[PDB]
Structure formats: C-alpha cells, structure tokens
Amino acid sequence: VPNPTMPVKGAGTTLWVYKGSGDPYANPLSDVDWSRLAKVKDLTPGELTAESYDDSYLDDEDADWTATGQGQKSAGDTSFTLAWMPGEQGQQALLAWFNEGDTRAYKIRFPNGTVDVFRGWVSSIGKAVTAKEVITRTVKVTNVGRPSMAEDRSTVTAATGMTVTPASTSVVKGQSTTLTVAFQPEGVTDKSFRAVSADKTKATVSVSGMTITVNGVAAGKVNIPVVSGNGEFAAVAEITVTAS
Amino acid sequence: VPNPTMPVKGAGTTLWVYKGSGDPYANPLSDVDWSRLAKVKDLTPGELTAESYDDSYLDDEDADWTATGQGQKSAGDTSFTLAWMPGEQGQQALLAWFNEGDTRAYKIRFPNGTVDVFRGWVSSIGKAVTAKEVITRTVKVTNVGRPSMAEDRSTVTAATGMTVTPASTSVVKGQSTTLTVAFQPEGVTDKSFRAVSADKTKATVSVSGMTITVNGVAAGKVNIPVVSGNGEFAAVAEITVTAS
Amino acid sequence: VPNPTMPVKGAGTTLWVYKGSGDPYANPLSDVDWSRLAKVKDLTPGELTAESYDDSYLDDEDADWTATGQGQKSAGDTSFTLAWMPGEQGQQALLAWFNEGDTRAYKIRFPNGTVDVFRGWVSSIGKAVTAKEVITRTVKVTNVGRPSMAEDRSTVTAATGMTVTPASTSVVKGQSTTLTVAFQPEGVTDKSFRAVSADKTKATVSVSGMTITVNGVAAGKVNIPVVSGNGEFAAVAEITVTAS
Amino acid sequence: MKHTELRAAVLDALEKHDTGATFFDGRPAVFDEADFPAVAVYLTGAEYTGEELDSDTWQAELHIEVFLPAQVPDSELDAWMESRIYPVMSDIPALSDLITSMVASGYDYRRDDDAGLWSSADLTYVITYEM
Amino acid sequence: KHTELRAAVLDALEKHDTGATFFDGRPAVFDEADFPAVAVYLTGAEYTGEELDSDTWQAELHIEVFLPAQVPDSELDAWMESRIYPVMSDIPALSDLITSMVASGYDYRRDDDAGLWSSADLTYVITYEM
Amino acid sequence: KHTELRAAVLDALEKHDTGATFFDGRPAVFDEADFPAVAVYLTGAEYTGEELDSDTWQAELHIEVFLPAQVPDSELDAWMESRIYPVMSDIPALSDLITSMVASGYDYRRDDDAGLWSSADLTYVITYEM
Amino acid sequence: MKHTELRAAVLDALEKHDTGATFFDGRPAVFDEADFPAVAVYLTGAEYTGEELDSDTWQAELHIEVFLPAQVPDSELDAWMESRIYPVMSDIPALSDLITSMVASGYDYRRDDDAGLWSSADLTYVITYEM
C-alpha cells in the first residue's frame, strides 16, 4: 500500500493525457476521460522556475547586499521518451496534438496515488534510431498556466483526539516501563510529539515506536511531560519509584 | 563531543525552515517552531560573492597594475535535493513557499553544533523520477541580504540551570494567578521556554516575557508542563482552582 | 635544508595573513605580526596577467604580422580551501575580513624560505557540505596592487674569487687527471663555467661535479681553457703528456 | 542488528509457505545429503552508500538461493522458484516494514566448480535500509 | 518464465531433427556417450528496468554444440549451419514471449579441464517481461 | 602510531567483556581451541596527503569475529550486536588519536581454504596523523 | 556459415604454397610430434559490431599460428612465417572476395605454460564481414 509520506521507489509512474472536454484539475484521480500513454521508456517532469526581480532603490540605505523578490513563475518543460509504435492509438493522437499545435491536459501518476496535472502544448517531437536498440519516439511539451501539483490535493488534520496511557507504578531498577501515546483525531492525524522527564537527575526517558520508555534509576516521584505541536496538547505522566 | 573548533565530516547535517513569527536571527540555537525537512539527499549551500568595483582614476601615478574594490556582496543560490514525499507538511509548506512570491528564513544545522540561518526565496522546484531510484524533489533558493554565518554567534554558554515554582493557590473565578520562573545558571543563557496546560479545559496558560499567568476557566486541578527550548529540559507544576 | 635553487616538493607550504599595522613587504620573513591560517586542504595562487595592447599604425609598412605590447598587469585571484572550524580564531577574523570588505595583506610560505606576499580583498566565501567528507570552507581573494614575489627578495653575487687548481703532470694513457674549479667569491656565487681543451686532436676533456677530467690519449703539451660568464674569468691549465 | 531481522523475516515468510526444504541462514559451504532441495538466505555487499545527509542508510544485496541435487535441468530449478519463492517474495509486510526500498536485481544459475554435486538457482535483490 | 523460453527453443530444435542429445541448462560434466550434445540455456538474467511502468529483463541466450575432442573446427560449423541456424532464423513460438532478439557472438571453446568435449556457442541477447 | 590505534580499540573491547580470544593483527594460524576470536587490524595505510602543511593518513580499520564453521549467519550478528557494536558506538580513547571515522562495510567470509573458521568483518574507514 | 568459408580459403591458400607442415582448422589442444611444423587457422571474438543500419556485419579476429618444437629461438619462427605465410597473406583474391575489409592487428610469440613442449608464433588480423 503506497503512502505519500514515505520515499517511493520510482517505478510504476504512469503518464496519461486528457481526451474529453471537462476540467482535469477537478478529479485527476479518475481515469475515465484520460488515455494512457503506454510504454514510457523514461520521463523527466519540468522544473518550476521563477526569475529574479530587483527591489533595490537609490534611497535604500543598503548597497552591499542584493535584495530580490520572486519574479514571474514559469512551469518548465516536460520531456519523455517512449518506444516507437506509430500505428497504435495514443501516438497518432499525440502527433495530431503536435501538428495542430494546441494546448491540452496531461498528468503524471506516481506510485502513491499522487498525480501531477499539467497542461501544455508540444514543443519538440523527435526520434532516435540506432541498430540493436528499440527505436525511441521522444517528446517534449511546454506547459502553460499553473499545474495543480500533488501537494495541492493533500489534506491535513489536527482534530484533538490525543491521549497518553500511563503506568504510574513503582518502577524497579533494571526494568523499563512503557507508556503509550494515543494519536487519533478519529483515525488520521498529522502531528508529532516530544516527551521529556521533569527531573533528568533520577530517572531517564526515551521515545521510540510512538511510545515512551522510562527507566527509574533512582526513586521518588518522577514527572514526564509530553507536548505536541507548539503546545496544542500535553500530558503529564506521574510515576512513583522506590529505592528497590 | 560537539566541538566546532575541530574539523568534522558533515554527516548528520539537518535543515529546517521558520514556521513562526519573531526574530529568527536572535536564537537559532533553539528549535521552537522550526520545521525540519526530512530525508535530505544532498545540499549545496550558497556562496558569499562580491562585486569588484573598478577604482582607477586618470590622475593616479602610473596604471600598470589594476586597483579594484569590494561592492555588492550578494550571498545567494543555496540548492538542495530531498526525497519526494508529498504526504506530510514541512514539504507542503515548501510548495506553499513557492506558490506565493515570499521570502522566508531557514536554518542549516551542522554536526558540530553550530547553526546557520539564511533568508531567501524559492526560485526553482524540480523532480527527478527514474526507475530503480527513489523519486526526489530538487529545490533551489536565492538568498537576500546579509545571512547569519555561525561565526557571528561565537559564545554559547550551554545554560544548565533553572527553576519554576507556582503560586499553587485556589483560583477565584474572574481572577487569574501568576507563576514564578527561573532560567539563570549564573545568569547567561541562550535558550527560550514554552508553557502548556495538560487539560487546557479547566485552565489555560499565558507565557511571555519571562512571565507565566495561570487562568482557571474552571475549578479542580490543573497540571502545567513547561519545556524549554529544543526539549532537553522539562518540568511540571500544579495549580488548584475552586468554583465558589 | 631547503635550497631555492632546486625543485621543491610542494607539501609544507603554509599560508599567513597580516594582523598588525606595518608594511608587510619590508620583512615578510618574520611571522611576528602575522596570524597562521591553519589546516589548508588546498590552495591555488593567482596568476599574474597582462592584456594585449595594440601598437599598429596605418602608416606602419606592415599589416600581416600583429604587433602588440604588454597592456596593464593584473595580479590574478588566489583560491584556497580549508577545513570548516567556525569557532577557532583565524576563521572569524577571515569572515570579518569579508563582511567588512577591505583589503589586507597575506603571504604564502613555500618550503624554501621563499614567501610570495600579496594584498587584496576577499571576493568569494563558500562552503561545500557532503556526507563522509570533511566540510570545506572555501575562500577566494582578489589581489590588488602588485605582489612582491619571491624572485624580488633573492640576491645574486659575482664577487670574483674563482680559481682553477691544475695537475700539469705527465698524464699516462689509461688514466684520467682531475682539475678542481674553486668557485668562491667569498662563499656564495651565482655563475657557471665551461672548460674545453685547446687541441681536441690528442686528448679529451669532460666536466662533472664542478671539476674537470682530462684523458691524455696522446702526448704533447695540451692546454685546457676554462671560461665563465661572458668572459669574466678564464684559466688556462697546461698539461704535459709523454708517449707512455 | 537489522541484518538479523532482515534474514529472519524473509526466512520465516518462506517457511510459512510450503515446507519440504532445509533453510540455511546464509549460504553454507558443504551441503551433505538429505539437506537437498534447500533454500539459503544471505546478504552480500552491505556498504555505507551515504545518499542521505541525515543518517546512515546502508545498502546491501539479498540473496535467496535454491539448491537442487546432482544434474537436474534448470527447468527443475525454475519450477521450484516459480512455485515456492516467487509467490512469497511478491509481498512481505514484515520485510517492507523493516526496510526503505527493494528492487529486483538478478537471477542466476550456478554449479559447483569443485565437486559437481549441487545445482543452485540464485535470486538477488538490492535492499537499501537505515542500519 | 525462463522455462517457457528454453521450452520453446528446445521444442523447436528437437522438432527439426532428433539426431542429437538436447540439454536444458548447461551440462556440468558430459559422458563419453551422449555427444552431438546441443545445450540451450540463459546467462545474466537481470532486471535492466529500462522501461518504466513495467518489469523488463535482459539475458544472454546460449545455443551450444558439443562434439568430441579434436574434430576440425569447420565440422562444428557444419553442424550449426544445418541444424541450428535454419531453425533459429525464425522460432515463431519463442518470438511470442520476448520483445527483442539480438545476435551477440559465436565462439569456440574446448575442454580445457580434461579434453573430452569441444564446443561452439552461438549467443544471442534477448529481452522479455517476466 | 598504529600500535596506539589498535591498542585503544583492543583495550576497550577486552574491557567490555573478556569472553573472547582477542587478536592484534590478522591471525593466519587458527587453532580449534581459540575460537570466539575478535581480531582487530588495519589495511591500506597509505599517505593520502589531502591536507597541506601536515601528513594525514587513511586506513581501513577492521574488527572481525571468528566463530566455528557452520554456525548460522545470525549467530555471527548476535555476537556483534552485543559485544562489538555497543562498545564501538563510541571509543573516546581511539577518538583522541584520529580525525574522522566512517563506516564502510560489514561482510561475511568463510574458510574457503579448509573450513575451520567462519567470520564477520565490520570495516570502518579512518584517517589520522602519524 | 561464412566462418567455414574463411578458414577454408586461408588454409587452401597456405597449402597451395610450400607444404611440409600439418594444417589444423582451428587451434587444437594437443600437438603430436611428427605433428610439429604445424600451421593453425582459427577465429576469435566474432561479435555483432552493428556499424551498419542495413545488415549484420559481424567482426572477428583471424589467427594464423605457426607451431615449432622444443626450444627453437624465435629467429626460427620468424624464418618460417617470412618464408611461408607472409608471401601468401600479401593478397588472397578468394579471401577478399569473401569479406569486406581486413587489417593487420598483431604478431605474438607464445609458449606452453603447462608442459613446455612447443613454441608458437601467432599472426592476428581483424576481419569485418557480412555474416
């Protein structure tokens, strides 16, 4: 099961092109009105740029350090090479796209359920032929407008369903207690936590596997505060330890 | 073991961006409301250039040797590539930072404990997908103004000493109590502190300017954790409230 | 013991920077008022250039071969990479040098007692970070003025104390006589010599180890003139040989 | 370390499928007899490909070798891996939990140049993990 | 899948003429009796992964002829000119399973170990999908 | 100098627990009685001379575990997980003498010669000044 | 194939010149004794250098080795191929009819590291042919 939160291998990224008449950005997930550009040897998505714009004034009291601001953005250039199958549908449509020279929508589907949707017009159709190597039809499209990138269709949650399950028992020397950090705003959250003791002179704490380990090397009542966000929620676990 | 005065190998260098307000250049040693970017594949920091201002004059006795000077310095163009995970924030904040032509500050934390903070804007956002290699997001930022090299903050006293004691008085409705704080290991520190309520429903906390105020929206007991700076130091206080 | 007259290995070349207030060119040998820039991973001294200047006239009777003269000189650009020690003295002074942007003096001390002294203003301060490799702080200084290179502080002597010690004995066949060339202009001279016989039909001469070997393959009186400089001094060694 | 957990995860996953074969943690030297058809799980390489300015992230190769006796034609070995190893290493939740990414690398046929006793079919993956 | 490859190749070869002892995978040590031993096998079957979206493999497919000890090299050729090449010009079946079929080499090897078998190997380079 | 290196490393290891036979430099004579055998040594100690003004050396420091002949590979790891890694996460005594210390590899080797010893070598790459 | 034709062409051309030596199609493993004064014609390499978008155009190396007995000084082998092989390989109409182009490559002196019984002088050409 792909998770858009962990690094992904980079094989299985397919590439589609619109053929219908709607707005591709609305539901890029669905592949109903999208043709699949088959047998993609290699692709390289374009790089989103923005040239510099000066913000320097004669009256400005500085003149040694440049001041600049984001100029006008530009959505790069997407270049991909596929195997030459001239007579199969999906390549003749592409050649028509180039020779009639108009902008249509295309999308890149990573193996995450995250799809980068662009729109553009072909700027270069090529082909490289050598013996003993599959004839490559090469393509490059210049994008216009602004892609609705994958980060735009992600969602985040902070619905405050957080709790900490303690032990609060007389932890012995040579043994470690486990306290659990329940992290669910009904299923899905998007935040981390930091748990640290209140003494750091009698007992020690550690965080692993979302849970917190306490070693009471010395006795007394030891407090473990756990805080998340910038202080959205915190829990104080009280632990007792005797000399044993 | 962290010794800036000796060479280091540079592995373990993390980098963060300012997800907050305030003055970042003051205490970059703290990790309060700094968001770390994960799985940085590689990084190339900006270089502090200079613009050679010509300084010849037809008067000058003999001209067989050039004479120039220093002008517009313009430290800029730090770039980096990290692993592509559109599922979590910190990365989403990055494409937000690209979306609007914004300037923001961000820190690079080196293994020798020194902290670097720059301020700049994103000028390139590119992705390099290939078979048999993890998809990576490659971004490039152009800096502005004078940055804050680690050689500028060259004292660091490491703190190690503080206290906090509460009023621990029954809070009347309509009035809030006040707490007592201390961050003085011989007076000199380079760290801040943050305070939070454990339940946050019977009382709340107001920390600023070395002061803490405890306001009992409801009665009962309210346990207030306070964790200072990065998180190495934490403590717990208690306060009582009665409704009548 | 280094000798500036023989090729040197290029390891042990240290690099200093002025910190006092005098004239560094006067006694660059002394390191009293000079800080030592430690742990130099690599350095590349700048190259002294001079652009072409035309000397071509319309009335000049040539037009096929370009005639040019030395334009205005320029003392290159010195570039050196050291290991990143942010906190140690010597790098903070360097960063101050850059951020206050003013020309100071520096010197390069080869393993010869020959020191190339430049003065200049730093133009580029950089840093390259990769894992498993010592973080490098890279620097580049643009020199102004004119360096007082090592060839300027060398001295030459021609104090006329040369002599030639002969044998002038009946050299036998199958044996070679040795004649010595004293080159003492009071210890230190800076000239060579050439010794050649006056017949080249009866006996032969050879030069090695500052001394001269004579093989009298045939009899008679053979003369060997030794001349040096352009004719500053010469010695005629008379040798007798019999048939034996 | 993580190597022990990796080898244990793959080997238990294989043994959960149809048994009847010896299982060698690692490639052993001698095979005796009645140890035949056997399966061996070992690791080769296991370097420190930096490839991350945050942590270690070692990279290694994982070998699953199937040993058969005497001079079986390679069609016998292909039969085994298609039956008992391919359907298993299609998906292992424990394995992918343990590591970052794995890719198929190679599939070889080997014999013994010393004796000429066993014929092995080797499967090799490339696993990058945070050691 | 490799079973399908060598199956198609061996079936075509044996159908052409059953005048030889045909081997699936390289024999380790031969007997003195089998010979005109035509072996067929694969080498270096590794996931090249040149094609996204799919898993494509590339391997060296060997067709080898084993004939006694000191036969003239031109006799090795004469066998392959008749029994191997005309078949391998077109192996319809096999051509279904693969995507490309490139000739790589043709080498003569001897039993440097003992001296029992001589051989000529014709090596193609193929790619396919598992 | 290298004596100081392997001295610090061997001393730290032997202090952790004296449950093994500890070897300075690679052993070539492996009896049947020494076994669980932690050898520590250096390879490729050559003057890289990256730093001017100074002489800096770089060498591959090996820590090797020798255990019988057929033990499961996971047994080799189990020894290193407990008696080698926790020590060598930090050696202050060694850390004085050197300037950098990176991991390089972790490989399993057998007694291809006879079959007496099995071993796992953990190899770091270090640099120092002589 | 063509290989048979190349080897036969060169060997017949050599045998049309002065005889007195055994002729081995290919380099044989073992040499008898009266089997000395010998000439061997074999091919090495024989790849598929594409180098043409129209046809196969393989490329190979052609070896003509002259074997002599015992410890003859190399002046003996040079004497042989200057006399009996060089005047032949100057030009062969049949050979150049068979192939596209041939260039001289190398000329070596070899011995037997196993026994130490024969000394050989090797001549190597590069022949590019349309297979």
Chain E hits for D109, Cβ within 8 Å: 25-26, 41-43
**Residue G116: which region, alpha, beta or left (left: phi > 0; alpha: psi -120 to 50)?**
left
Query: G71 CA to chain E: closest CA distance, Å?
Result: 24
- In terms of CA atoms, which chain A residue is nearest residue D102? A9
- E-assigned strand segments in chain G: 22-25, 38-47, 58-69, 101-111, 118-129
Q: In chain F, what is the straight-line distance between the N-terminal and C-terminal CA atoms, in Å? A: 6
C to D CB pairs, distance under 8 Å = 8
Q: Mark out chain C residues that contact chain F at CB-CB < 8 A.
A: 11-14, 38-43, 83, 132, 134
Q: A with F: 3 or more CB pairs under 8 Å? A: no
Whether the Cβ atoms of residue G93 and residue G37 lie closer than 8 Å to each other: no
CB within 8 Å: G53 and A130: yes
Method: cryo-EM
The set of residues, in sequence order, having a beta carbon less than 8 Å from that of E47 and lying 6+ positions away, is B132, D103, D104, D105, D106, E55, E56, E57
In sequence order, the β-bridge partners of residue E67 are E118
Query: A115 CA to chain E: closest CA distance, Å?
Result: 15
E77 has a chain G CB within 8 A of its CB: yes
- In terms of CA atoms, which chain A residue is nearest residue G51? A131
Residue tagged 């300017």 (tokens)? B209
Give the mutation candidate from C110, C134, C136, C137 for the F interface (greatest F CB count, under 10 A). Answer: C134
Q: What are phi and psi of G70, to 5 degrees?
A: 60, -125
Determine how many CB atoms are found less than 10 A away from the CB of residue A20.
11
**Tokens read off for B28:** 């970059």
- In terms of CA atoms, which chain D residue is nearest residue E57? D106
F88: helix, strand or coil: helix
| Length in residues, chain G | 131
CB within 8 Å: D78 and E3: yes
CB within 8 Å: C130 and D50: yes
Element (H, E) at A44: strand A40-44
CB within 8 Å: D101 and A7: yes
Query: E47 CA to chain D: closest CA distance, Å?
Result: 5
CATH of the structural domain F1-129, one choice from 3.40.50.1260, 3.30.950.10, 3.40.50.10490, 3.30.70.1700: 3.30.70.1700
Determine the Cα–Cα distance for residues B116 and B152; give it in Å rounded to an integer: 9
**Tokens read off for D61:** 């190769």
| Length in residues, chain F | 130
CB within 8 Å: C40 and F51: yes
Determine the Cα–Cα distance for residues C144 and C152; give it in Å rounded to an integer: 18
In angstroms, what CA-CA distances link C12 with B200, C117, E51, F54?
Answer: 66, 17, 54, 7
C153: helix, strand or coil: helix
Chain B hits for F99, Cβ within 8 Å: 6-7
Determine the Cα–Cα distance for residues G126 and G46; give it in Å rounded to an integer: 10
**Where would I find the H helices in chain C?**
92-100
In sequence order, the β-bridge partners of residue B15 are B37, B108
Of F12, F2, F81, F80, the C-alpha closest to F41 is F2
Determine the Cα–Cα distance for residues F57 and F63; give it in Å rounded to an integer: 19
Element (H, E) at G84: helix G74-84
Query: A241 CA to chain B: closest CA distance, Å?
Result: 17
Q: What are phi and psi of D92, to 5 degrees?
A: -135, 105
Determine the Cα–Cα distance for residues B78 and B121; give it in Å rounded to an integer: 10
CB within 8 Å: F102 and C43: no
Q: Which residue type is seen at F109?
A: R
In angstroms, what CA-CA distances link C229 with A94, B165, C160, C223, D78?
Answer: 84, 94, 11, 20, 89
CB within 8 Å: D55 and B14: no
Determine the Cα–Cα distance for residues B192 and B32; give it in Å rounded to an integer: 8
Determine the Cα–Cα distance for residues B172 and B174; give it in Å rounded to an integer: 6
Query: D46 CA to chain C: closest CA distance, Å?
Result: 16
In angstroms, what CA-CA distances link G114 with C54, G26, G67, G110?
Answer: 75, 20, 16, 12
DSSP tag of A148: B
CA geometry: angle at G19 spanning G15 and G22, to 5°?
80
Burial of A99 from C-beta contacts in 10 A (0-12 / 13-18 / 19+): exposed
Pairing between strand C233-241 and F37-47? Answer: unpaired
In angstroms, what CA-CA distances link B218 with B223, B243, B244?
Answer: 13, 7, 10
CB within 8 Å: D101 and A11: no
Q: Which residue type is seen at G12?
A: D
Evaluated on CA atoms C9, C10, C11, C12, the torsion sign reads positive
Half-sphere exposure of residue B10: CA atoms within 13 angstroms, side-chain side: 24
G88: helix, strand or coil: helix
Evaluated on CA atoms A206, A208, A212, A216, the torsion sign reads negative
Query: F74 CA to chain B: closest CA distance, Å?
Result: 29
Query: E46 CA to chain B: closest CA distance, Å?
Result: 13
Residue tagged 């200047």 (tokens)? C53
Evaluated on CA atoms B14, B15, B21, B27, the torsion sign reads positive
Of E26, E41, E30, E12, the C-alpha closest to E114 is E30
Give the mutation candidate from B43, B132, B136 for the D interface (greatest D CB count, under 10 A). Answer: B132
CB within 8 Å: A7 and D100: yes
| CATH fold of D2-130 | Alpha-Beta Plaits (3.30.70)
Residue tagged 């019999």 (tokens)? C242
Burial of F40 from C-beta contacts in 10 A (0-12 / 13-18 / 19+): buried
Determine the Cα–Cα distance for residues E37 and B36; give it in Å rounded to an integer: 66
Determine how many CB atoms are found less than 10 A away from the CB of residue G129.
20
Determine the Cα–Cα distance for residues F82 and F72; give it in Å rounded to an integer: 16
Q: Mark out chain G residues that contact chain A at CB-CB < 8 A.
A: 48, 50, 52-53
Pairing between strand E37-47 and D101-111? Answer: antiparallel
CA geometry: angle at B191 spanning B189 and B195, to 5°?
125
E81 has a chain G CB within 8 A of its CB: yes
Burial C73-95 (b: 16+ CB within 10 A, else e): ebbbbbbbbbbbbbbeeebbebb
**Residue C47: which region, alpha, beta or left (left: phi > 0; alpha: psi -120 to 50)?**
beta
Chain F hits for C13, Cβ within 8 Å: 52-53
Whether the Cβ atoms of residue C180 and residue C168 lie closer than 8 Å to each other: no
- In terms of CA atoms, which chain D residue is nearest residue B132? D103
Q: Mark out chain B residues that contact chain D at CB-CB < 8 A.
A: 10-14, 38-43, 132, 134
Of C180, C171, C183, the C-alpha closest to C215 is C171
The set of residues, in sequence order, having a beta carbon less than 8 Å from that of C62 and lying 6+ positions away, is none
Whether the Cβ atoms of residue B151 and residue C86 lie closer than 8 Å to each other: yes
Burial F24-38 (b: 16+ CB within 10 A, else e): eeebeebeeeebebb
Q: What are phi and psi of G74, to 5 degrees?
A: -60, -20
- In terms of CA atoms, which chain D residue is nearest residue F123? D47
Determine the Cα–Cα distance for residues C85 and B212; give it in Å rounded to an integer: 40
**Tokens read off for E87:** 């078949």
Residue tagged 């030794």 (tokens)? C226
Whether the Cβ atoms of residue G44 and residue G60 lie closer than 8 Å to each other: yes
Whether the Cβ atoms of residue E85 and residue E78 lie closer than 8 Å to each other: no
Query: D16 CA to chain F: closest CA distance, Å?
Result: 19
**Tokens read off for C213:** 């070997």
In angstroms, what CA-CA distances link C27 with C46, C78, C143, F24?
Answer: 22, 22, 19, 53
Chain A hits for E99, Cβ within 8 Å: 134
E23 has a chain D CB within 8 A of its CB: yes
Burial of B174 from C-beta contacts in 10 A (0-12 / 13-18 / 19+): exposed
CB within 8 Å: B132 and E49: yes
Determine the Cα–Cα distance for residues G29 and E111; give it in Å rounded to an integer: 9
Chain A hits for D100, Cβ within 8 Å: 6-7
The three-state DSSP-derived secondary structure of chain B is CCCCCCCCCCCCCEEEEECCCCCCCCCCCCCCCEEEECCEEEEECCEECCCEEECCCCCCCCCCECCEEECCCCEECEEEEEECCCCCCCCHHHHHHHHCCCCEEEEEECCCCCEEEEEEEEEEEEEEEECCEEEEEEEEEEECCCCECHHHCCCCCCCCCCEEECCCCCECCCCCEECEEECCCCCCCCCCCEECCCCCCCCEEEEECCEEEEECCCCEEEEEEEEECCCCEEEEEEEEECCC
Of A38, A50, A48, the C-alpha closest to A14 is A38
Whether the Cβ atoms of residue B50 and residue C123 lie closer than 8 Å to each other: yes
CB within 8 Å: G52 and A131: yes
Whether the Cβ atoms of residue E53 and residue A40 lie closer than 8 Å to each other: yes
Query: D56 CA to chain B: closest CA distance, Å?
Result: 9
**Tokens read off for A236:** 């104080």
The set of residues, in sequence order, having a beta carbon less than 8 Å from that of B56 and lying 6+ positions away, is B63, B66, B67
Q: What is the dihedral of CA F63, F66, F67, F70, to 10 degrees?
A: 110
DSSP tag of A152: G
The three-state DSSP-derived secondary structure of chain D is CHHHHHHHHHHHHHHHCCCCCEEEECCCCCCCCCCCCEEEEEEEEEECCCCCCCCCCEEEEEEEEEEEECCCCHHHHHHHHHHHHCCCCCCCHHHHHHCCEEEEEEEEEEECCCCCCEEEEEEEEEEEECC
CB within 8 Å: E52 and A132: no
Q: G with B: 3 or more CB pairs under 8 Å? A: no
A4: helix, strand or coil: coil
C10: helix, strand or coil: coil
CB within 8 Å: G53 and A129: yes
Burial of E41 from C-beta contacts in 10 A (0-12 / 13-18 / 19+): buried
Whether the Cβ atoms of residue G74 and residue G97 lie closer than 8 Å to each other: no
**Tokens read off for E35:** 């010979």
Chain C hits for D48, Cβ within 8 Å: 132
**Residue B174: which region, alpha, beta or left (left: phi > 0; alpha: psi -120 to 50)?**
left
CB within 8 Å: A129 and G52: no
Query: B132 CA to chain E: closest CA distance, Å?
Result: 7
Q: How far is CA C224 from the centre of its chain?
A: 33
Determine the Cα–Cα distance for residues E37 and E111; give it in Å rounded to an integer: 14
Of E105, E107, E101, E104, the C-alpha closest to E89 is E101
Interface chains of chain A (3 or more CB pairs under 8 Å): B, D, E, G
Q: Mark out chain D residues that contact chain B at CB-CB < 8 A.
A: 50-55, 100-101, 103
Burial A203-233 (b: 16+ CB within 10 A, else e): bbbeeeeeebebbbeebeebbbbbbbeebeb
In angstroms, what CA-CA distances link G93 with D91, G4, G99?
Answer: 65, 17, 10
Determine the Cα–Cα distance for residues E49 and E46; give it in Å rounded to an integer: 9
Chain C hits for F102, Cβ within 8 Å: 132
Determine the Cα–Cα distance for residues B121 and B106; give it in Å rounded to an integer: 10
Chain A hits for G53, Cβ within 8 Å: 129-131
Query: B130 CA to chain E: closest CA distance, Å?
Result: 8
CB within 8 Å: D42 and F107: no
Determine the Cα–Cα distance for residues A205 and A213; give it in Å rounded to an integer: 6
Q: Which residue type is seen at B182?
A: A
Evaluated on CA atoms A60, A62, A66, A68, the torsion sign reads negative
